[PDB]
């Protein structure tokens, strides 16, 4: 079964553990292209009582740089916030826990805002169908295909 972090049947503990960035998308492509601060490769999620410990690494010249973010629950169900290159809030619009997870993030910095959407998998790659379901959700958010980058081939160190 599938669920939304904002839904009533959400079991946050089940997203604990290993994850991999499969696809990233944004209405500001520069944020996710090479050297962008948001071209983030998720490695693991440690679920706590009121927060999520997210372990990522960014890459440059194929050299991996580790970085962690601690996301705290906000006043709205299913949403977390975290300070990183500005102020961010995010939810998990859809996940089946054991294979894929789709996240939707909003960043606000120095008066500007942009959306970041990601498809993460328990394995380093996911099927065609889930990737297209993700492009459909991006569309619902106003993000077109030219702003959707498949990183499944570049997610290893």
Helices (H), 35-146: 128-140
**Tokens coding 127:** 């099927």
> Rounded CA gap, 10 and 26, in Å?
25
What is the arrangement of strands in the sheet containing 63-73, beginning at the earlier edge strand?
Answer: 17-18, 41-47, 51-60, 63-73, 80-83, 87-95, 100-109, 112-121, 20-26, 148-150
> Facing residues of 104 across strands?
91, 117
> Rounded CA gap, 109 and 135, in Å?
26
> Rounded CA gap, 151 and 76, in Å?
30
> Facing residues of 103 across strands?
118
> Rounded CA gap, 51 and 80, in Å?
7
Q: Which residue has the tokens 């990601």?
A: 118
> Rounded CA gap, 19 and 61, in Å?
22
Cα dist. 28→32, 85, 121, 144, 148 in Å? Answer: 8, 14, 23, 11, 10
Query: How many structural domains does the chain have?
Result: 1
Q: Which residue has the tokens 């991996």?
A: 64
Data resolution in angstroms: 2.0
**Tokens coding 20:** 């991999």
Q: Which domain holds residue 29?
A: 1-157
DSSP letters spanning 45-77: EEE-SSEEEEEEEEEETTEEEEEEEEEEE-SST
> Rounded CA gap, 14 and 18, in Å?
11
**C-beta atoms surrounding 54 within 10 Å:** 22
> Facing residues of 53 across strands?
46, 70
Q: What is the CATH number of the domain that holds 6?
A: 2.40.128.20
Backbone angles phi, psi at 87, to 5 degrees: -110, 125
């Amino acid at each position: 079964e599938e669920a939304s972090s904002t839904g009533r049947n959400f079991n946050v503990e089940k997203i604990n553990g290993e994850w991999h960035t499969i696809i990233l998308a944004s209405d500001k492509r520069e944020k996710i292209e090479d050297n962008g601060n948001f071209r983030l490769f998720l490695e693991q999620i440690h679920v706590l009582e009121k927060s999520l410990v997210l372990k990522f690494h960014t890459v440059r010249d194929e050299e991996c740089s580790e970085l962690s973010m601690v996301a705290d629950k906000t006043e709205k169900a299913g949403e977390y916030s975290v300070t990183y290159d500005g102020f961010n809030t995010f939810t998990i619009p859809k996940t089946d826990y054991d294979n894929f997870l789709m996240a939707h993030l909003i960043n606000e910095k120095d008066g500007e805002t942009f959306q970041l959407m990601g498809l993460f998998g328990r394995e380093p790659d996911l099927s065609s169908d889930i990737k297209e379901r993700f492009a459909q959700l991006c569309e619902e958010h106003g993000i077109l295909r030219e702003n959707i980058i498949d990183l499944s081939n570049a997610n290893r160190c």
